[PDB]
Amino acid sequence: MKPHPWFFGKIPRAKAEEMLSKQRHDGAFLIRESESAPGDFSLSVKFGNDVQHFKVLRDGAGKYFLWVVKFNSLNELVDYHRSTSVSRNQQIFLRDIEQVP
Ligand SMILES: CNC(=O)C[C@@H](Cc1ccc(OP(=O)(O)O)cc1)C(=O)N[C@@H](CCC(N)=O)C(=O)N[C@@H](CC(N)=O)C(N)=O
Ligand SMILES: [Cl-]
Ligand SMILES: [Cl-]
Ligand SMILES: [Cl-]
Ligand SMILES: [Mg+2]
């Protein structure tokens, strides 16, 4: 149907921070392909004047997770975290970034 506005591919950790620092709302995020760990994904989220980074972990079957609950896709991981916090220190819910039209 429509492509996801959150997949940025191989953008540096620093480029994710540059982009997200311009976003107004907390929870504004992106999924990127890690450069420090090739083959692994990373989640970058906006919170205040900072950008929090999370590593997308894998189990033995290749399922994705951030903490405990695991999923069959990055798509389901992202969607679950729109209603359950990505952080254990703050209530940060994932919301789509405000794109340059
Ligand atoms: C300053 N340390 C970090 O940024 C590492 C970060 C996880 C992390 C580690 C490496 C990394 O490399 P790259 O950006 O892809 O090149 C990206 C993210 C973390 O610990 N994130 C925190 C959550 C955000 C924060 N409080 O700064 C955490 O507890 N993460 C959990 C859960 C997770 N899945 O990341 C963990 N470390 O297992
Ligand atoms: Cl914005
Ligand atoms: Cl690590
Ligand atoms: Cl929650
Ligand atoms: Mg979806």
UniProtKB/Swiss-Prot annotation:
<comment type="function">
    <text>Non-enzymatic adapter protein that plays a pivotal role in precisely regulated signaling cascades from cell surface receptors to cellular responses, including signaling transduction and gene expression. Thus, participates in many biological processes including regulation of innate and adaptive immunity, autophagy, DNA repair or necroptosis. Controls signaling complexes at the T-cell antigen receptor to facilitate the activation, differentiation, and function of T-cells.</text>
</comment>
<feature type="domain" description="SH2">
    <location>
        <begin position="6"/>
        <end position="98"/>
    </location>
</feature>
<feature type="cross-link" description="Glycyl lysine isopeptide (Lys-Gly) (interchain with G-Cter in ubiquitin)">
    <location>
        <position position="55"/>
    </location>
</feature>
<comment type="similarity">
    <text>Belongs to the GRB2/sem-5/DRK family.</text>
</comment>
<feature type="modified residue" description="N6-acetyllysine">
    <location>
        <position position="55"/>
    </location>
</feature>
<comment type="subunit">
    <text>Homodimer. Associates (via SH2 domain) with activated EGF and PDGF receptors (tyrosine phosphorylated). Interacts with PDGFRA (tyrosine phosphorylated); the interaction may be indirect. Also associates to other cellular Tyr-phosphorylated proteins such as SIT1, IRS1, IRS2, IRS4, SHC and LNK; probably via the concerted action of both its SH2 and SH3 domains. It also seems to interact with RAS in the signaling pathway leading to DNA synthesis. Interacts with SOS1. Forms a complex with MUC1 and SOS1, through interaction of the SH3 domains with SOS1 and the SH2 domain with phosphorylated MUC1.</text>
</comment>
<comment type="subunit">
    <text>(Microbial infection) Interacts (via SH3 domain) with hepatitis E virus/HEV ORF3 protein.</text>
</comment>
<protein>
    <recommendedName>
        <fullName>Growth factor receptor-bound protein 2</fullName>
    </recommendedName>
</protein>
